[PDB]
Design a protein around this ligand. Structure first.
Ligand SMILES: NC(=O)COc1ccccc1
Ligand SMILES: NC(=O)COc1ccccc1
Ligand SMILES: NC(=O)COc1ccccc1
Length: 287
């Protein structure tokens, strides 16, 4: 396991790496970081060059100032440049949460850069906007996104030894038994080293708050309405963040899709049920 920086699109991003061969690139979301992919890295690094990126703003990655530095086009370009910078023209892209918001958008725009997409809980660009418009449960579930627009949010997340973040991801994971003591320390270190401000900046560029923005077909601007590469969804049904109906009718937008639903996994199946997840991944990668 190697840990290093790569300079792309005007920033230095930290990533962890293991193995060699075809690139399997993992994108985490909020408030995680590259470490959340540890079990997939260990599983696949004899078959792939497994690389888990820390997104800009997160953990040891550079934390550029200003909201403009966290706009979708910039984040998408980060991904393109990371792929090329590592020496590849395409990859197997594995994504979750904000990394899925970015990763889906990337795959729609650059399907030539993605051999296969594996997506965990997170917003599909078309179905998410539909669910925000019509699914009262999704609307309630996504209320915190309005709250995140507010300057007061960071203190709730950081105060008392990151109490808000601990409550969000640590306490559920320790209680359910999928976080070790070293995992907890790794998360706490990621929050000391990273910037919660930068993490929140991602949300503060979201266009889902005006009646006009809500009208748009995709979460982020896209000319492409179909993605035809092979795609696997691996979804925790108990996720309080994204309702299961986000998967409804998804074939219209992603014709070659396979879906695996974990009845008793929540927001982050990749580390909640790594063995089940890993076998589903093997199966998809081999078919
Ligand atoms: N864990 C989270 O709150 C992330 O939620 C979102 C992630 C991406 C785009 C919109 C919302
Ligand atoms: N109820 C609506 O039409 C809008 O709902 C939401 C829109 C954005 C974030 C949270 C909720
Ligand atoms: N990261 C989030 O916003 C949600 O985090 C979790 C939520 C429920 C169970 C596990 C993690």
């Amino acid at each position: 396991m190697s840990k290093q920086y790569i300079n792309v699109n005007g920033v230095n991003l930290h990533y962890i790496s293991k193995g060699q061969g075809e690139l399997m690139l993992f994108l985490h979301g909020f408030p995680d970081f590259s470490h959340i992919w540890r079990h997939q890295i260990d599983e696949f690094s004899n078959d792939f060059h497994t690389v888990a990126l820390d997104l800009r703003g997160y953990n040891l990655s550079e934390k550029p100032s200003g909201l403009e530095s966290y706009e979708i086009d910039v984040l998408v370009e980060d991904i393109r440049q990371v792929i090329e910078g590592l020496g590849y023209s395409s990859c197997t892209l594995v994504v979750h949460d904000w990394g899925a918001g970015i990763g889906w958008t990337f795959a729609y725009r650059y399907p030539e850069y993605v051999q296969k997409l594996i997506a965990f809980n997170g917003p599909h660009p078309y179905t998410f906007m539909r669910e925000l418009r019509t699914n009262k449960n999704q609307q309630k579930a996504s209320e915190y996104m309005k709250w995140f627009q507010k300057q007061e949010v960071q203190d709730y997340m950081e105060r008392d030894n990151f109490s808000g973040l601990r409550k969000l991801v640590i306490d559920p994971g320790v209680k359910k038994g999928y976080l070790t003591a070293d995992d907890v320390q790794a998360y706490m270190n990621s929050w000391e080293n990273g910037s919660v401000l930068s993490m929140l900046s991602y949300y503060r560029n979201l266009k889902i708050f005006t009646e006009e923005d809500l009208r748009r077909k995709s979460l982020f601007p896209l000319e492409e309405e179909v993605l035809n590469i092979p795609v696997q969804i691996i979804w925790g049904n108990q996720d309080p963040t994204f309702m299961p109906e986000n998967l409804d009718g998804i074939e219209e937008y992603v014709p070659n899709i396979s879906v695996h639903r974990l009845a008793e996994a929540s927001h982050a199946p990749q580390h909640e049920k790594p063995q089940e997840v890993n076998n589903v991944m093997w199966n998809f990668l081999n078919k």
